[PDB]
Design a protein around this ligand. Structure first.
Ligand SMILES: CC(=O)SCCNC(=O)CCNC(=O)[C@H](O)C(C)(C)COP(=O)(O)OP(=O)(O)OC[C@H]1O[C@@H](n2cnc3c(N)ncnc32)[C@H](O)[C@@H]1OP(=O)(O)O
Length: 147
């Protein structure tokens, strides 16, 4: 058994629509705002869930470095969040490094679904992913993806 608290924001942006019922009333609604989801908690001292990371495979139609079309099905980062007040504490790096270690895969080999400015900075500074191959499908892949 274990305890689980969701900050307001992480609770709403949860990448899974979940209704929790009590034998019949509802305890919590998450998500109002081939796959693997990673969650992370901290003793603080009364516990709390601080981040989540969802990755999964997805068939993608991409352009290569010279515009040639091509299909591929890489592991993709689909959702990635750390409750706001606790960003830049290292939690993001924790979740991400675990995922890589166990999925046994490198950042440059992944596609990134609609990364935000914070996530881009995170990828660029922490994993030196800087050179992106332009897409038109809202996924971001870097040069290593094709090498
Ligand atoms: C595919 C999808 O999931 S789309 C992307 C999702 N992004 C969002 O929803 C917005 C923000 N939410 C977040 O949870 C975080 O900002 C994440 C997921 C990007 C990173 O998690 P954090 O725990 O905050 O990152 P962590 O503390 O592990 O590493 C720090 C690095 O992240 C980046 N970072 C985190 N917050 C910021 C910020 N406000 N401005 C700029 N860079 C930031 C920087 O590269 C920073 O490096 P520095 O501290 O050396 O400058």
């Amino acid at each position: 058994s274990f305890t689980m608290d969701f900050p307001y924001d992480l609770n709403a942006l949860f990448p899974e629509r979940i209704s929790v019922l009590d034998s019949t009333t509802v305890i919590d609604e998450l998500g109002k705002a081939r796959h693997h989801l990673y969650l992370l908690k901290d003793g603080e001292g009364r516990g709390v869930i601080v981040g989540f990371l969802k990755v999964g495979y997805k068939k993608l139609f991409l352009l290569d470095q010279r515009g040639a079309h091509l299909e591929t099905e890489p592991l993709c980062v689909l959702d990635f969040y750390v409750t706001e007040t606790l960003q830049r504490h290292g939690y993001g790096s924790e979740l991400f490094d675990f995922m890589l270690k166990h999925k046994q895969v490198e950042p440059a080999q992944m596609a990134y679904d609609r990364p935000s400015p914070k996530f881009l900075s995170f990828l660029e500074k922490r994993y030196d992913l800087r050179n992106s191959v332009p897409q038109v499908n809202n996924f971001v892949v870097f040069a290593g993806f094709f090498q």
